[PDB]
Amino acid sequence: EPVGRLHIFSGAHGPEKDFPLHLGKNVVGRMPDCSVALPFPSISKQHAEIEILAWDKAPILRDCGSLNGTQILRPPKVLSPGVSHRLRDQELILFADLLCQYHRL
Amino acid sequence: EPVGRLHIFSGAHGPEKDFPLHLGKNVVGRMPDCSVALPFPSISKQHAEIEILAWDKAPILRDCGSLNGTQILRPPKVLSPGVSHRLRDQELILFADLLCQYHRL
């Protein structure tokens, strides 16, 4: 049923966790209603989104106007609001200071 | 015996791996004889050095004039050759396009 998963490494925020990613918009945010719920003060209510349109198309990551930002490593930079970034299998990203890794299932 | 560990995250290059770090100069490079051997095209023969110091002092990370560079994250910082960067526990490091993480043991 899920197309991918997002792994959030253990850190200053607490223990490791994994989140399934589905077709459609997967919201990353502080609230429990988010697909990727990260209840930490540095994470915005609607922080970012990972949109998956098809099983065989790369997910697209966007920042939603978050306070503390989203960072990519291809190339290393802050991903500004509204700019699309296509994720590759095993790609690492940061939401505020939280390191995450995307896995295609 | 090892007093540190360098973690290399998984990616398109292959699976995750850990490397022990010892007191003194731990060379990071493409060569098999390097303390931290990273057999990937983007990594220079002598890429960087992590100097582990005694007396609980912070290790020193230096770039050895590599082709593709070394960078630090949270916050992002480009590491020029000749700069001694003092590593913090759990520091994220980019060698070329390869993400790794330093752990004090």
From Swiss-Prot, chains A, B:
Modification Phosphoserine, positions: 80
Post-translational modification: Phosphorylated upon exposure to ionizing radiation (IR), ultraviolet radiation (UV), and hydroxyurea (HU). Phosphorylation in response to IR requires ATM, NBN, and possibly CHEK2. Also phosphorylated during the G2/M phase of the cell cycle and during activation of the mitotic spindle checkpoint. Ubiquitinated by RNF4, leading to proteasomal degradation; undergoes 'Lys-48'-linked polyubiquitination.
Domain FHA intervals: 26-77
Tissue: Highly expressed in testis.
Domains: entry comment: Tandemly repeated BRCT domains are characteristic of proteins involved in DNA damage signaling. In MDC1, these repeats are required for localization to chromatin which flanks sites of DNA damage marked by 'Ser-139' phosphorylation of H2AX.
Function: Histone reader protein required for checkpoint-mediated cell cycle arrest in response to DNA damage within both the S phase and G2/M phases of the cell cycle. Specifically recognizes and binds histone H2AX phosphorylated at 'Ser-139', a marker of DNA damage, serving as a scaffold for the recruitment of DNA repair and signal transduction proteins to discrete foci of DNA damage sites. Also required for downstream events subsequent to the recruitment of these proteins. These include phosphorylation and activation of the ATM, CHEK1 and CHEK2 kinases, and stabilization of TP53/p53 and apoptosis.
Protein name: Mediator of DNA damage checkpoint protein 1
Organism: Homo sapiens
Residue numbers of the full-length protein present here: 29 to 133 of 2089
